[PDB]
């Protein structure tokens, strides 16, 4: 199926408590495979997935260098961001970055990203054309002029179209046993009386991967969108995820409701009900 690789930067300043902490994590779909922490004893890129360990020693050193240089780049970016917003040097601030590429089954570039955020708000982002930028304000505009001058988009496009997809393609092969395996969810409905007139029906989905999934409750065939309680998908801790959709139905009308499940690990969308 489709796949994606993404890198996430987190540069948090901490006034009076040392230099800003820089963190990097690489993900392939919903799996984490690399991590860099400027706070670690020996700051360097470390493997987080079995299939990445087989990379040559040059790999790990090349990657660790990038992150080290980036540690400085973004620490400088945090200082620069302070001036752009006329902010004090006594407050803590955060810069976030998430970029990467998406590919279809044929492993071809589908889309590319590179977004930067400051204190949670959008700052600047590379447009889908991979050649133009979008500045959220006059401050990010300054950064845009710099990036256009230093031909940054050009460099990113090159990566996004070359190395990004190439390395991802290689990663998918080495970890095909897991990265290319979709585990369907395990489902069941629970019955929990709320009163003498209403009861709660909860549709569960467990041990599935990837995280993407769709749970819906239907009343006589009608989706109970604005009526269903849908908890945020959560990680089980074993690479798989969990999620449930609940709906309060009148007692004696439980058979008028049906739960629908959609996951790429299932050949056909599922449908279940309360099983007394």
């Amino acid at each position: 199926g489709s796949h994606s690789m993404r890198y996430f930067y987190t540069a948090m300043s901490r006034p009076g408590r040392g230099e800003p902490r820089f963190i990097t994590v690489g993900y392939v779909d919903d799996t984490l495979f690399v991590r860099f922490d400027s706070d670690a004893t020996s700051p360097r890129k470390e493997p987080r997935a079995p299939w990445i360990e087989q990379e040559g020693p040059e790999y790990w050193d090349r990657e660790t260098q990038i992150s080290k240089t980036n540690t400085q780049t973004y620490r400088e970016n945090l200082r620069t961001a302070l001036r752009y917003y006329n902010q004090s040097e006594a407050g803590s601030h955060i810069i976030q970055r998430m970029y990467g590429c998406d590919v279809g089954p044929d492993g071809r570039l589908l889309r590319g990203y590179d977004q930067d955020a400051y204190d949670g708000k959008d700052y600047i982002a590379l447009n889908e054309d991979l050649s133009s930028w979008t500045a959220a304000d006059t401050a990010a505009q300054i950064t845009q002029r710099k990036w256009e001058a230093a031909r940054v988009a050009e460099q990113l496009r090159a990566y996004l179209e070359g190395l990004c997809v190439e390395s991802l393609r290689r990663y998918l092969e080495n970890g095909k046993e897991t990265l290319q395996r979709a585990d369907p969810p395990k489902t069941h409905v629970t019955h929990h009386p709320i009163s003498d007139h209403e009861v709660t029906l909860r549709c569960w989905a467990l041990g599935f991967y990837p995280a993407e999934i769709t749970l819906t409750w239907q009343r006589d065939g009608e989706d109970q969108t604005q009526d269903t309680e849908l908890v945020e998908t959560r990680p089980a801790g074993d690479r798989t995820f969990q999620k449930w959709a609940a709906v309060v139905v009148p007692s004696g009308e439980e058979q008028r409701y049906t739960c629908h499940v959609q996951h790429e690990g299932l050949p056909k969308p599922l449908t279940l009900r309360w099983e007394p």
Partner: protein
Amino acid sequence: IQRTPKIQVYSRHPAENGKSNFLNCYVSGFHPSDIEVDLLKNGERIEKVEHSDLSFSKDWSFYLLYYTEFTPTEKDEYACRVNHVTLSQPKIVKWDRDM
């Protein structure tokens, strides 16, 4: 400017007294990143509790997973205690084997 963390307490596998399992507390949708989370057994801070590497969603909000191994019973009670810059007092969520 700041986002309060959403909290969920649950087990990796379906509960079963006597059988070993994992107790999880998933905090998400918060900002900034600084946060303090403890897993409580009958009210006491369980020692040696691990957590995943900090990451964030598409809306830039952070999320972490705190987990500890454990064997549930019908008497022991577990909960998660969370504190964040957006919380005046630590919030506590009692585990529920049906949530």
